[PDB]
Subunit: 288 residues, 3 copies
Amino acid sequence: MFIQEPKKLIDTGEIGNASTGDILFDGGNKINSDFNAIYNAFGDQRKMAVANGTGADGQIIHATGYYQKHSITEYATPVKVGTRHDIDTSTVGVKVIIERGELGDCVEFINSNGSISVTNPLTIQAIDSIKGVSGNLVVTSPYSKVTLRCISSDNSTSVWNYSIESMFGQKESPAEGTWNISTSGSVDIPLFHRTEYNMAKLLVTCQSVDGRKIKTAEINILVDTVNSEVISSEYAVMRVGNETEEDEIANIAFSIKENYVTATISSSTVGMRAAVKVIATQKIGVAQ
Amino acid sequence: MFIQEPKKLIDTGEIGNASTGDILFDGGNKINSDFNAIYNAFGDQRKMAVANGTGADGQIIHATGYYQKHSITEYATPVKVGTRHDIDTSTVGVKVIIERGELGDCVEFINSNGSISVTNPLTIQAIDSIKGVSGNLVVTSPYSKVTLRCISSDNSTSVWNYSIESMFGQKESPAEGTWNISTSGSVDIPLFHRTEYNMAKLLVTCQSVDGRKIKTAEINILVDTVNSEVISSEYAVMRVGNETEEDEIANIAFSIKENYVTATISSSTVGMRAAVKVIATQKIGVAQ
Amino acid sequence: MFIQEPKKLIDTGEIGNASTGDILFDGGNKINSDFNAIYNAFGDQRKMAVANGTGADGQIIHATGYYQKHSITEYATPVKVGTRHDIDTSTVGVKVIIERGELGDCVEFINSNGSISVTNPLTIQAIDSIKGVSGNLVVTSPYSKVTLRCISSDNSTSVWNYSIESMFGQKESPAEGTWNISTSGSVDIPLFHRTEYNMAKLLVTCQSVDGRKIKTAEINILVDTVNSEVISSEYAVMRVGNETEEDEIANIAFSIKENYVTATISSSTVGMRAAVKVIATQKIGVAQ
């Protein structure tokens, strides 16, 4: 691997005190050291084996950043904080060790070839320990993204915590916000175009400006494109200042309006607010 | 657009072999080429039309990184791997093509002005193909973030996969971990301050140290700030080593303790562990 | 704090017009200005108090990027766009102000020491305003990541929107895609190894190639490792072109096959597609 050297700056404090030969060699090497540190942090380090990362197929600065691809032997020694790794466990699981960190230090991993599995796992050991984990963190989720962050350093108290998430997938939320139920006692909230999703899941919480009346419900909806309708299943309904155990506080209906799956929120109680949030969706794609 | 040139390094191998005129011109241009590559990867490229990205309103290095704003004509030719784009489809949908990549290569998109829609979509074509997609990827989610990653290159097998997520929204989880049910047979788990959310959704899985007794349940809770209470709706309950089809394995209750919405987990079975995870929340904000 | 100066480039347009003394001093300072701008955007700025970020414990380029740790007094003045902050509110809440931005500008925050709370909050004021927020954004979620983005600038119309998410936690999805129900009328979809999770939540939507028959359901499953089985709870079922209100359109079963929790989708209707997506999981870890 390439272990950069800290930042070096040109000592302009000299020059009319050391001739042109020494300042260009002590300056050049300094400029080549820094850039190398920058290009290897945002570029493929494997290219250093050529013209020192130069040439036509040389190193470039990836705006998206870069995740280095190292070998087993290289991971035999603790990795430096701030590095990025694209793990490959196709032939065998790989063990990565992170040097002791300080508050905020970070190391990130990805698995572009999706080799991570239970037989060929990604084992991570963060010098000292990882919260909620006894020993090493064993990652078995293919195509994942792992982020490790030091949440405590001080003296020996060098503890880390982590997050693991999928590199891919449709995770967006087509709608999230708060709307007022107009004086007319009804409000339309467009969620998404009829062609965007087959089903969605949302959370709806209606509350009076005073806070004495409140209702929340979870609703799953199915888009019936053929009949231009939307089926819904409202459950886990909870109410507080409901004057009666009958129809109450706020009603939620669905349909397609202007070609947009839409939520219609109505209420008898004047001055009602309604928070709507889509927390999940499913879209039928192409098999395989 | 600005298409950077690979990394260039100063040939200190010369100097006391080529006078000061040539090494400063061949060196300078080299230093201006690299920096330009770095500033345009982390800065607004549109500024290159001025003093070459210099001056008072010149280019700067964004720690948050930067997402270039290009024109239709510029996107007429395949984009380089590692680039970032802030799409604008307000006047019409825009088609972006990505050059053939290699394992790990990445291109990211965002939609700051939220112009992306079904009529003005973001069409992405990744040289060769995108997994689970027949043809181009058609993005219609406004204010989204799209990440494309090459999961296979080798020879022609240059396939990509993607993720799409919302740029905005409250997605945090106020609590996630595992707690022991004390010998007393009860444990309190603070979830969040009473003022942080109106409703939350959590997953609770209790299992004996031996693994013969286990229960999981999904619970939606509503915060009643006025009465300082919390309503809950527990469903999809599943149990395994339940000695009876009556009350069993573990009970989950909610309330406000020390001003924190809290989960109280109790069980008759000695040596029980309880994993609690909040997977969704809703907070009434200000309309519009 | 360190407020960088815009990009500076070496004026090769001179040299055989200004002797070696002036071009090295005007060039050097230029090279030290740029690098400093780069290292402070991707490195600990607190080190500038030493050998100007040099030496053994000098500044380095973090591939993962870096989040600066500033003081209360420093945050007394508006922060520059593109900066990153690791907030510390252990002693008291901290107020951060962001200078007026332009479309796409971004500022990101993290909370490595998890000091953020309702008593010691992170208050953010984005010059002009933040959508859906009246006044300042008050963040009380510990160990969070806050991203602010300008979604509109033009003249005075400088509005921002935000996202807030947990720095840590298991958020991955072990499976998401679309599969064809083979002519045999049944398809097996492996979700994850039996040891990866105790419970999972998934969304399943089956639709005929023509679109007249469609069903969606939400299912929570519990992994019974001891008996090598999987309990499931299917609910919120919705159907459209169901010829009868009896068993219909598609059945979903679960079990362990080849040591992988697996979903078996079957249907009488020929030519059926089935989208499966795991949207939540829970894994019992180690207490504390």
